[PDB]
Ligand binder design. Sequence first.
Ligand SMILES: OC[C@H]1O[C@@H](O[C@@H]2[C@@H](O)[C@H](O[C@@H]3[C@@H](O)[C@H](O[C@@H]4[C@@H](O)[C@H](O)O[C@H](CO)[C@H]4O)O[C@H](CO)[C@H]3O)O[C@H](CO)[C@H]2O)[C@H](O)[C@@H](O)[C@@H]1O
Ligand SMILES: OC[C@H]1O[C@@H](O[C@@H]2[C@@H](O)[C@H](O[C@@H]3[C@@H](O)[C@H](O)O[C@H](CO)[C@H]3O)O[C@H](CO)[C@H]2O)[C@H](O)[C@@H](O)[C@@H]1O
Length: 432
Amino acid sequence: SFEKTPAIKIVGNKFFDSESGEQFFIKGIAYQLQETSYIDALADPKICLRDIPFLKMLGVNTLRVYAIDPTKSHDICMEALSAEGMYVLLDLSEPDISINRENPSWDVHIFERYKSVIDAMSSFPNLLGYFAGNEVTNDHTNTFASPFVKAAIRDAKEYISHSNHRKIPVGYSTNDDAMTRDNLARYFVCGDVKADFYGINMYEWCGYSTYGTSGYRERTKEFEGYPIPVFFSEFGCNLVRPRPFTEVSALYGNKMSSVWSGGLAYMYFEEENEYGVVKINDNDGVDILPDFKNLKKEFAKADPKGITEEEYLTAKSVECPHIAVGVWEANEKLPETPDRSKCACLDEILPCEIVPFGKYEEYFSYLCSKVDCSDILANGKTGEYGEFSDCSVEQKLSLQLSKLYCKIGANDRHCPLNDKNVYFNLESLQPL
Ligand SMILES: OC[C@H]1O[C@@H](O[C@@H]2[C@@H](O)[C@H](O[C@@H]3[C@@H](O)[C@H](O[C@@H]4[C@@H](O)[C@H](O)O[C@H](CO)[C@H]4O)O[C@H](CO)[C@H]3O)O[C@H](CO)[C@H]2O)[C@H](O)[C@@H](O)[C@@H]1O
Ligand SMILES: OC[C@H]1O[C@@H](O[C@@H]2[C@@H](O)[C@H](O[C@@H]3[C@@H](O)[C@H](O)O[C@H](CO)[C@H]3O)O[C@H](CO)[C@H]2O)[C@H](O)[C@@H](O)[C@@H]1O
Protein backbone atom coordinates (compact mmCIF):
# COMPACT_ATOMS: atom_id res chain seq x y z
CA SER A 1 0.00 0.00 0.00
CA PHE A 2 1.08 3.49 -1.00
CA GLU A 3 -2.10 5.04 0.55
CA LYS A 4 -0.17 7.32 2.93
CA THR A 5 1.72 8.88 -0.02
CA PRO A 6 -0.59 9.98 -2.85
CA ALA A 7 1.38 11.10 -5.92
CA ILE A 8 2.36 14.79 -5.86
CA LYS A 9 1.67 16.77 -9.02
CA ILE A 10 2.73 20.24 -10.19
CA VAL A 11 0.30 23.08 -10.99
CA GLY A 12 1.97 26.36 -11.98
CA ASN A 13 4.65 27.16 -9.39
CA LYS A 14 3.33 24.90 -6.62
CA PHE A 15 3.20 21.18 -5.70
CA PHE A 16 -0.17 19.59 -4.83
CA ASP A 17 -1.31 16.30 -3.29
CA SER A 18 -3.19 14.75 -6.25
CA GLU A 19 -5.74 13.17 -3.93
CA SER A 20 -6.54 15.95 -1.43
CA GLY A 21 -5.70 19.02 -3.56
CA GLU A 22 -3.77 20.59 -0.64
CA GLN A 23 -0.46 22.31 -1.37
CA PHE A 24 2.52 20.05 -0.72
CA PHE A 25 5.45 21.50 1.18
CA ILE A 26 8.75 19.65 1.34
CA LYS A 27 10.03 19.04 4.87
CA GLY A 28 13.08 17.09 3.94
CA ILE A 29 16.51 15.78 4.61
CA ALA A 30 19.32 14.57 2.35
CA TYR A 31 20.00 10.86 2.88
CA GLN A 32 23.16 9.44 1.29
CA LEU A 33 25.93 7.27 2.64
CA GLN A 34 29.46 7.78 1.28
CA GLU A 35 30.87 -2.86 -6.36
CA THR A 36 29.66 0.66 -7.04
CA SER A 37 31.55 3.79 -5.93
CA TYR A 38 28.37 5.04 -4.27
CA ILE A 39 26.26 3.23 -1.64
CA ASP A 40 22.57 2.80 -2.39
CA ALA A 41 20.94 2.77 1.04
CA LEU A 42 17.51 2.36 -0.64
CA ALA A 43 18.57 -1.01 -2.12
CA ASP A 44 19.46 -2.35 1.34
CA PRO A 45 16.59 -2.95 3.80
CA LYS A 46 18.86 -3.34 6.85
CA ILE A 47 20.04 0.24 6.29
CA CYS A 48 16.79 2.04 5.33
CA LEU A 49 14.81 0.10 7.92
CA ARG A 50 17.33 1.13 10.61
CA ASP A 51 17.03 4.83 9.68
CA ILE A 52 13.31 5.27 8.89
CA PRO A 53 12.31 5.27 12.64
CA PHE A 54 14.79 8.15 13.16
CA LEU A 55 13.63 9.92 10.01
CA LYS A 56 10.07 9.61 11.36
CA MET A 57 11.19 11.24 14.68
CA LEU A 58 12.67 14.18 12.73
CA GLY A 59 9.25 14.75 11.12
CA VAL A 60 10.42 14.76 7.49
CA ASN A 61 8.09 13.94 4.59
CA THR A 62 10.85 13.91 1.95
CA LEU A 63 14.35 12.53 1.41
CA ARG A 64 16.84 13.64 -1.20
CA VAL A 65 18.92 10.77 -2.54
CA TYR A 66 21.87 11.48 -4.86
CA ALA A 67 22.65 8.01 -6.18
CA ILE A 68 20.82 4.70 -6.59
CA ASP A 69 21.93 1.47 -8.24
CA PRO A 70 19.23 0.77 -10.89
CA THR A 71 20.22 -2.89 -11.12
CA LYS A 72 18.92 -3.49 -7.56
CA SER A 73 15.37 -3.69 -6.19
CA HIS A 74 13.98 -0.66 -4.28
CA ASP A 75 10.44 -1.74 -3.40
CA ILE A 76 11.10 -2.69 0.24
CA CYS A 77 12.64 0.68 1.17
CA MET A 78 10.25 2.66 -1.04
CA GLU A 79 7.22 0.93 0.55
CA ALA A 80 8.66 1.38 4.05
CA LEU A 81 9.11 5.10 3.31
CA SER A 82 5.54 5.33 1.99
CA ALA A 83 4.21 3.64 5.16
CA GLU A 84 5.71 6.60 7.03
CA GLY A 85 4.42 9.28 4.61
CA MET A 86 7.83 9.88 3.07
CA TYR A 87 8.65 10.86 -0.53
CA VAL A 88 11.93 10.76 -2.43
CA LEU A 89 13.66 13.36 -4.63
CA LEU A 90 16.29 11.51 -6.65
CA ASP A 91 19.26 12.51 -8.85
CA LEU A 92 19.48 10.63 -12.13
CA SER A 93 23.28 10.88 -12.31
CA GLU A 94 26.00 9.33 -10.18
CA PRO A 95 29.57 10.58 -9.53
CA ASP A 96 31.15 8.41 -12.26
CA ILE A 97 28.32 9.10 -14.76
CA SER A 98 27.39 12.81 -14.75
CA ILE A 99 27.62 15.75 -17.14
CA ASN A 100 31.25 16.91 -16.77
CA ARG A 101 31.02 20.64 -15.98
CA GLU A 102 34.50 21.38 -17.35
CA ASN A 103 34.23 19.25 -20.52
CA PRO A 104 30.51 18.74 -21.00
CA SER A 105 28.83 16.14 -23.21
CA TRP A 106 25.23 14.91 -23.48
CA ASP A 107 25.63 11.41 -24.86
CA VAL A 108 24.30 7.86 -25.06
CA HIS A 109 26.27 6.70 -22.05
CA ILE A 110 24.91 9.36 -19.65
CA PHE A 111 21.40 9.18 -21.19
CA GLU A 112 21.35 5.38 -20.72
CA ARG A 113 22.22 5.94 -17.02
CA TYR A 114 19.29 8.38 -16.75
CA LYS A 115 16.82 5.97 -18.42
CA SER A 116 17.96 3.08 -16.20
CA VAL A 117 17.24 5.11 -13.05
CA ILE A 118 13.85 6.22 -14.49
CA ASP A 119 12.93 2.64 -15.24
CA ALA A 120 14.10 1.47 -11.83
CA MET A 121 12.21 4.09 -9.78
CA SER A 122 9.10 5.35 -11.64
CA SER A 123 6.64 2.70 -10.33
CA PHE A 124 6.61 4.31 -6.86
CA PRO A 125 3.89 6.93 -6.18
CA ASN A 126 6.19 8.43 -3.54
CA LEU A 127 8.87 9.31 -6.08
CA LEU A 128 8.42 13.07 -5.86
CA GLY A 129 10.73 14.12 -8.71
CA TYR A 130 14.07 13.56 -10.50
CA PHE A 131 16.99 15.94 -10.80
CA ALA A 132 18.57 15.94 -14.27
CA GLY A 133 21.63 17.65 -12.77
CA ASN A 134 23.16 19.07 -9.62
CA GLU A 135 25.40 22.18 -9.58
CA VAL A 136 26.82 21.44 -13.03
CA THR A 137 27.56 25.05 -13.93
CA ASN A 138 28.75 26.38 -10.57
CA ASP A 139 30.40 29.67 -11.55
CA HIS A 140 31.07 32.04 -14.47
CA THR A 141 33.83 29.78 -15.90
CA ASN A 142 31.57 26.84 -16.80
CA THR A 143 28.18 28.28 -17.81
CA PHE A 144 28.54 26.48 -21.17
CA ALA A 145 27.64 23.24 -19.39
CA SER A 146 24.02 24.35 -18.84
CA PRO A 147 22.77 23.67 -22.42
CA PHE A 148 23.79 20.02 -21.88
CA VAL A 149 21.78 19.94 -18.66
CA LYS A 150 18.81 21.49 -20.46
CA ALA A 151 18.99 18.84 -23.20
CA ALA A 152 19.04 16.19 -20.40
CA ILE A 153 15.88 17.71 -18.88
CA ARG A 154 14.20 17.67 -22.31
CA ASP A 155 15.21 14.07 -23.03
CA ALA A 156 14.40 12.73 -19.56
CA LYS A 157 10.91 14.34 -19.72
CA GLU A 158 10.30 12.95 -23.23
CA TYR A 159 11.54 9.50 -22.20
CA ILE A 160 9.13 9.62 -19.25
CA SER A 161 6.33 10.99 -21.49
CA HIS A 162 6.74 8.17 -24.04
CA SER A 163 6.98 5.47 -21.32
CA ASN A 164 4.06 3.79 -19.50
CA HIS A 165 5.14 5.48 -16.23
CA ARG A 166 3.39 8.24 -14.23
CA LYS A 167 4.79 11.59 -15.46
CA ILE A 168 7.22 12.22 -12.62
CA PRO A 169 8.61 15.79 -12.97
CA VAL A 170 12.22 16.42 -13.88
CA GLY A 171 14.03 19.42 -12.44
CA TYR A 172 17.42 20.87 -11.60
CA SER A 173 19.42 21.54 -8.42
CA THR A 174 21.72 24.56 -8.39
CA ASN A 175 24.33 26.20 -6.13
CA ASP A 176 24.17 29.81 -4.86
CA ASP A 177 26.99 31.65 -6.70
CA ALA A 178 26.07 35.35 -6.78
CA MET A 179 27.44 36.09 -10.28
CA THR A 180 25.53 33.21 -11.98
CA ARG A 181 22.37 32.60 -9.99
CA ASP A 182 20.01 35.01 -11.73
CA ASN A 183 21.12 33.78 -15.17
CA LEU A 184 20.89 30.14 -14.19
CA ALA A 185 17.35 30.51 -12.86
CA ARG A 186 16.12 32.29 -16.01
CA TYR A 187 17.97 29.90 -18.32
CA PHE A 188 16.28 26.82 -16.86
CA VAL A 189 12.83 28.27 -17.65
CA CYS A 190 13.72 30.01 -20.95
CA GLY A 191 12.83 29.04 -24.53
CA ASP A 192 11.03 25.78 -25.36
CA VAL A 193 12.54 23.47 -22.76
CA LYS A 194 11.99 24.07 -19.06
CA ALA A 195 12.86 22.42 -15.75
CA ASP A 196 9.66 21.22 -14.01
CA PHE A 197 10.99 22.48 -10.66
CA TYR A 198 14.05 24.22 -9.33
CA GLY A 199 16.02 23.48 -6.16
CA ILE A 200 18.71 25.71 -4.69
CA ASN A 201 21.50 24.63 -2.39
CA MET A 202 20.93 27.43 0.09
CA TYR A 203 23.48 28.11 2.88
CA GLU A 204 23.02 31.88 3.40
CA TRP A 205 21.48 31.54 6.88
CA CYS A 206 24.10 30.63 9.49
CA GLY A 207 23.58 30.44 13.23
CA TYR A 208 20.99 32.75 14.78
CA SER A 209 20.36 34.84 11.68
CA THR A 210 17.17 36.57 10.50
CA TYR A 211 14.90 36.74 7.46
CA GLY A 212 16.23 40.16 6.49
CA THR A 213 19.88 39.84 7.35
CA SER A 214 20.45 36.30 6.06
CA GLY A 215 19.58 37.19 2.51
CA TYR A 216 16.40 35.15 2.63
CA ARG A 217 14.25 38.18 2.09
CA GLU A 218 16.26 39.14 -0.97
CA ARG A 219 16.06 35.59 -2.41
CA THR A 220 12.32 35.51 -1.74
CA LYS A 221 11.75 38.77 -3.62
CA GLU A 222 13.93 37.49 -6.50
CA PHE A 223 11.93 34.28 -6.95
CA GLU A 224 8.50 35.87 -6.47
CA GLY A 225 6.47 34.87 -9.57
CA TYR A 226 9.05 32.35 -10.87
CA PRO A 227 6.93 30.05 -13.09
CA ILE A 228 7.93 26.64 -11.60
CA PRO A 229 8.03 25.33 -7.99
CA VAL A 230 11.15 26.41 -6.17
CA PHE A 231 12.66 25.08 -2.93
CA PHE A 232 15.86 24.69 -0.94
CA SER A 233 17.32 21.46 -2.29
CA GLU A 234 19.86 21.81 0.57
CA PHE A 235 20.03 24.03 3.65
CA GLY A 236 21.85 24.00 6.97
CA CYS A 237 24.98 26.16 7.15
CA ASN A 238 27.08 24.65 9.96
CA LEU A 239 29.19 27.71 10.83
CA VAL A 240 27.55 27.88 14.27
CA ARG A 241 26.92 24.63 16.13
CA PRO A 242 24.87 22.83 17.22
CA ARG A 243 22.86 24.10 14.28
CA PRO A 244 19.73 25.77 15.69
CA PHE A 245 18.03 25.54 12.25
CA THR A 246 16.07 28.79 12.88
CA GLU A 247 15.90 29.22 9.09
CA VAL A 248 13.14 26.59 9.19
CA SER A 249 10.93 29.06 11.10
CA ALA A 250 11.43 31.58 8.25
CA LEU A 251 11.09 29.09 5.35
CA TYR A 252 7.64 27.86 6.46
CA GLY A 253 6.49 31.24 7.80
CA ASN A 254 3.96 33.41 5.96
CA LYS A 255 6.21 35.47 3.63
CA MET A 256 8.33 32.56 2.39
CA SER A 257 5.46 30.02 2.26
CA SER A 258 3.85 31.96 -0.59
CA VAL A 259 7.03 31.61 -2.72
CA TRP A 260 9.04 28.57 -1.57
CA SER A 261 7.88 24.94 -1.57
CA GLY A 262 10.02 24.11 1.49
CA GLY A 263 13.45 22.48 1.56
CA LEU A 264 15.72 19.65 2.64
CA ALA A 265 18.26 19.88 5.43
CA TYR A 266 21.77 18.65 4.63
CA MET A 267 22.01 15.93 5.87
CA TYR A 268 21.15 12.73 7.78
CA PHE A 269 24.59 11.05 7.99
CA GLU A 270 27.59 12.54 9.71
CA GLU A 271 30.66 12.10 7.52
CA GLU A 272 33.53 13.88 9.32
CA ASN A 273 32.23 17.06 7.71
CA GLU A 274 30.05 18.14 10.63
CA TYR A 275 26.86 18.08 8.51
CA GLY A 276 25.07 15.06 10.02
CA VAL A 277 22.25 14.84 12.56
CA VAL A 278 23.23 11.21 13.32
CA LYS A 279 26.46 9.28 13.31
CA ILE A 280 26.61 5.57 12.55
CA ASN A 281 28.68 3.97 15.33
CA ASP A 282 31.11 1.03 15.12
CA ASN A 283 28.23 -1.33 15.91
CA ASP A 284 26.31 0.02 12.88
CA GLY A 285 23.79 1.67 15.21
CA VAL A 286 22.48 5.23 15.10
CA ASP A 287 23.97 7.76 17.53
CA ILE A 288 21.79 10.89 17.63
CA LEU A 289 23.88 14.13 17.43
CA PRO A 290 23.17 17.59 19.07
CA ASP A 291 21.66 18.99 15.81
CA PHE A 292 18.96 16.30 15.69
CA LYS A 293 16.71 17.74 18.43
CA ASN A 294 16.90 21.25 16.93
CA LEU A 295 15.86 20.09 13.45
CA LYS A 296 13.10 17.92 15.00
CA LYS A 297 11.69 20.84 17.06
CA GLU A 298 11.84 23.28 14.14
CA PHE A 299 10.05 20.91 11.68
CA ALA A 300 7.51 20.10 14.44
CA LYS A 301 6.71 23.82 14.77
CA ALA A 302 6.62 24.45 11.00
CA ASP A 303 3.03 24.84 9.79
CA PRO A 304 3.16 26.40 6.31
CA LYS A 305 -0.08 28.06 5.25
CA GLY A 306 -0.51 27.17 1.61
CA ILE A 307 -3.21 27.52 -1.01
CA THR A 308 -5.37 24.74 -2.40
CA GLU A 309 -5.18 23.55 -6.00
CA GLU A 310 -8.69 24.72 -6.86
CA GLU A 311 -8.17 28.25 -5.50
CA TYR A 312 -4.73 28.55 -7.10
CA LEU A 313 -6.27 27.61 -10.47
CA THR A 314 -8.94 30.34 -10.20
CA ALA A 315 -6.24 32.91 -9.35
CA LYS A 316 -3.97 32.68 -12.42
CA SER A 317 8.01 32.39 -23.60
CA VAL A 318 10.86 33.45 -21.26
CA GLU A 319 13.79 35.16 -23.02
CA CYS A 320 17.07 33.28 -22.55
CA PRO A 321 19.84 35.38 -20.96
CA HIS A 322 22.06 37.01 -23.59
CA ILE A 323 25.61 35.74 -24.08
CA ALA A 324 28.54 37.74 -22.64
CA VAL A 325 32.12 36.44 -22.73
CA GLY A 326 33.43 35.37 -19.29
CA VAL A 327 30.02 35.94 -17.77
CA TRP A 328 27.28 33.94 -19.47
CA GLU A 329 28.03 31.47 -22.23
CA ALA A 330 25.04 29.09 -22.32
CA ASN A 331 23.61 29.02 -25.87
CA GLU A 332 19.84 28.76 -26.28
CA LYS A 333 20.44 26.03 -28.89
CA LEU A 334 20.69 22.63 -27.23
CA PRO A 335 22.51 19.44 -28.16
CA GLU A 336 20.50 16.73 -29.93
CA THR A 337 18.83 13.75 -28.26
CA PRO A 338 21.49 11.04 -28.00
CA ASP A 339 20.77 8.30 -30.52
CA ARG A 340 21.74 4.83 -29.28
CA SER A 341 20.99 3.23 -32.67
CA LYS A 342 23.03 5.69 -34.69
CA CYS A 343 25.94 5.36 -32.28
CA ALA A 344 25.58 1.54 -32.09
CA CYS A 345 26.19 1.61 -35.87
CA LEU A 346 29.72 2.85 -35.19
CA ASP A 347 30.31 -0.26 -32.99
CA GLU A 348 29.34 -2.44 -35.97
CA ILE A 349 30.72 -0.82 -39.13
CA LEU A 350 33.89 1.03 -38.06
CA PRO A 351 37.12 -0.77 -39.08
CA CYS A 352 39.01 0.52 -36.01
CA GLU A 353 37.71 0.53 -32.47
CA ILE A 354 38.71 1.38 -28.90
CA VAL A 355 37.20 -0.67 -26.08
CA PRO A 356 35.90 0.89 -22.89
CA PHE A 357 37.59 -2.07 -21.12
CA GLY A 358 44.63 10.24 -18.79
CA LYS A 359 44.26 8.03 -21.87
CA TYR A 360 41.36 9.86 -23.57
CA GLU A 361 42.94 13.34 -23.61
CA GLU A 362 46.21 12.10 -25.09
CA TYR A 363 44.45 10.10 -27.80
CA PHE A 364 42.12 12.95 -28.76
CA SER A 365 45.08 15.36 -29.04
CA TYR A 366 46.91 12.83 -31.24
CA LEU A 367 43.96 11.89 -33.47
CA CYS A 368 42.40 15.34 -33.76
CA SER A 369 45.71 16.68 -35.07
CA LYS A 370 45.60 14.10 -37.85
CA VAL A 371 41.88 14.18 -38.76
CA ASP A 372 39.05 16.73 -38.43
CA CYS A 373 37.24 16.07 -35.15
CA SER A 374 34.41 18.56 -35.77
CA ASP A 375 31.89 15.72 -35.98
CA ILE A 376 32.40 14.82 -32.29
CA LEU A 377 32.88 18.30 -30.78
CA ALA A 378 30.09 19.83 -28.70
CA ASN A 379 30.18 23.54 -28.01
CA GLY A 380 27.66 24.87 -25.48
CA LYS A 381 28.85 28.45 -25.96
CA THR A 382 28.21 28.67 -29.72
CA GLY A 383 25.50 26.02 -29.81
CA GLU A 384 27.34 23.91 -32.39
CA TYR A 385 27.17 20.17 -31.88
CA GLY A 386 28.85 17.70 -34.21
CA GLU A 387 26.87 14.86 -35.79
CA PHE A 388 28.34 12.18 -33.53
CA SER A 389 28.97 14.37 -30.51
CA ASP A 390 26.18 12.40 -28.75
CA CYS A 391 28.01 9.07 -29.01
CA SER A 392 30.06 7.59 -26.15
CA VAL A 393 33.65 8.75 -25.65
CA GLU A 394 34.96 5.40 -26.99
CA GLN A 395 32.69 5.56 -30.04
CA LYS A 396 33.88 9.11 -30.74
CA LEU A 397 37.50 8.01 -30.45
CA SER A 398 36.91 4.92 -32.65
CA LEU A 399 35.39 7.13 -35.37
CA GLN A 400 38.48 9.33 -35.57
CA LEU A 401 40.71 6.27 -35.40
CA SER A 402 38.83 4.71 -38.35
CA LYS A 403 38.98 7.99 -40.32
CA LEU A 404 42.78 8.01 -39.90
CA TYR A 405 42.91 4.32 -40.93
CA CYS A 406 40.90 5.06 -44.10
CA LYS A 407 42.96 8.19 -44.79
CA ILE A 408 46.16 6.10 -44.62
CA GLY A 409 44.43 3.56 -46.89
CA ALA A 410 46.94 0.78 -46.26
CA ASN A 411 43.99 -1.60 -45.87
CA ASP A 412 46.11 -4.08 -43.87
CA ARG A 413 44.07 -4.28 -40.65
CA HIS A 414 46.63 -2.22 -38.75
CA CYS A 415 44.79 0.38 -36.71
CA PRO A 416 47.02 3.47 -36.51
CA LEU A 417 47.24 3.63 -32.70
CA ASN A 418 49.43 1.35 -30.57
CA ASP A 419 47.37 0.47 -27.49
CA LYS A 420 45.97 -2.71 -25.95
CA ASN A 421 42.46 -1.16 -26.06
CA VAL A 422 42.60 -0.71 -29.86
CA TYR A 423 41.36 -3.48 -32.14
CA PHE A 424 40.43 -4.12 -35.73
CA ASN A 425 36.68 -4.73 -35.99
CA LEU A 426 36.19 -7.93 -37.98
CA GLU A 427 32.45 -7.22 -38.35
CA SER A 428 33.51 -4.11 -40.37
CA LEU A 429 34.45 -6.57 -43.14
CA GLN A 430 30.92 -8.05 -43.28
CA PRO A 431 28.61 -6.42 -45.85
CA LEU A 432 25.35 -5.08 -44.35
O1 LIG B 1 34.45 19.61 -12.06
C1 LIG B 1 35.08 18.91 -13.14
C2 LIG B 1 35.11 17.41 -12.81
O2 LIG B 1 33.76 16.93 -12.96
C3 LIG B 1 33.65 15.50 -12.71
O3 LIG B 1 32.29 15.07 -12.86
C4 LIG B 1 31.49 15.66 -11.85
C5 LIG B 1 30.77 14.55 -11.07
O4 LIG B 1 31.71 13.82 -10.29
C6 LIG B 1 29.70 15.16 -10.18
O5 LIG B 1 28.96 14.09 -9.57
C7 LIG B 1 27.93 14.57 -8.72
C8 LIG B 1 28.44 14.44 -7.28
O6 LIG B 1 29.55 15.35 -7.06
C9 LIG B 1 27.29 14.71 -6.30
O7 LIG B 1 27.79 14.60 -4.97
C10 LIG B 1 26.84 15.04 -3.99
C11 LIG B 1 27.29 16.42 -3.49
O8 LIG B 1 27.10 17.37 -4.54
C12 LIG B 1 26.53 16.83 -2.23
O9 LIG B 1 27.07 18.06 -1.72
O10 LIG B 1 26.63 15.76 -1.22
C13 LIG B 1 26.00 14.53 -1.69
C14 LIG B 1 25.85 13.58 -0.50
O11 LIG B 1 27.13 13.39 0.09
C15 LIG B 1 26.87 14.01 -2.85
O12 LIG B 1 26.45 12.70 -3.33
O13 LIG B 1 26.24 13.72 -6.56
C16 LIG B 1 25.60 13.98 -7.85
C17 LIG B 1 24.34 13.08 -7.98
O14 LIG B 1 24.74 11.71 -7.92
C18 LIG B 1 26.65 13.74 -8.98
O15 LIG B 1 26.09 14.12 -10.24
O16 LIG B 1 28.82 15.91 -11.06
C19 LIG B 1 29.45 17.08 -11.62
C20 LIG B 1 28.41 17.93 -12.38
O17 LIG B 1 27.53 17.07 -13.08
C21 LIG B 1 30.54 16.59 -12.58
O18 LIG B 1 31.28 17.71 -13.13
C22 LIG B 1 34.51 14.68 -13.67
O19 LIG B 1 34.47 13.31 -13.29
C23 LIG B 1 35.97 15.16 -13.62
O20 LIG B 1 36.69 14.51 -14.67
C24 LIG B 1 36.06 16.69 -13.78
O21 LIG B 1 37.41 17.11 -13.54
O1 LIG C 1 30.63 32.72 -3.75
C1 LIG C 1 30.19 31.55 -4.41
C2 LIG C 1 29.53 30.63 -3.37
O2 LIG C 1 28.38 31.24 -2.90
C3 LIG C 1 27.79 30.51 -1.85
O3 LIG C 1 26.67 31.26 -1.59
C4 LIG C 1 26.99 32.43 -0.89
C5 LIG C 1 26.63 32.31 0.58
O4 LIG C 1 27.55 31.45 1.21
C6 LIG C 1 26.62 33.68 1.29
O5 LIG C 1 26.18 33.50 2.65
C7 LIG C 1 26.59 34.48 3.59
C8 LIG C 1 26.84 33.89 4.97
O6 LIG C 1 27.91 32.97 4.94
C9 LIG C 1 27.20 34.97 5.97
O7 LIG C 1 27.55 34.41 7.23
O8 LIG C 1 26.09 35.82 6.08
C10 LIG C 1 25.84 36.51 4.88
C11 LIG C 1 24.70 37.53 5.03
O9 LIG C 1 24.92 38.39 6.14
C12 LIG C 1 25.48 35.50 3.81
O10 LIG C 1 25.25 36.20 2.63
O11 LIG C 1 25.75 34.59 0.60
C13 LIG C 1 26.18 34.79 -0.74
C14 LIG C 1 25.34 35.80 -1.50
O12 LIG C 1 24.00 35.69 -1.12
C15 LIG C 1 26.09 33.48 -1.51
O13 LIG C 1 26.51 33.68 -2.84
C16 LIG C 1 27.26 29.18 -2.36
O14 LIG C 1 26.71 28.34 -1.33
C17 LIG C 1 28.30 28.44 -3.19
O15 LIG C 1 27.56 27.66 -4.06
C18 LIG C 1 29.13 29.36 -4.09
O16 LIG C 1 30.29 28.70 -4.54
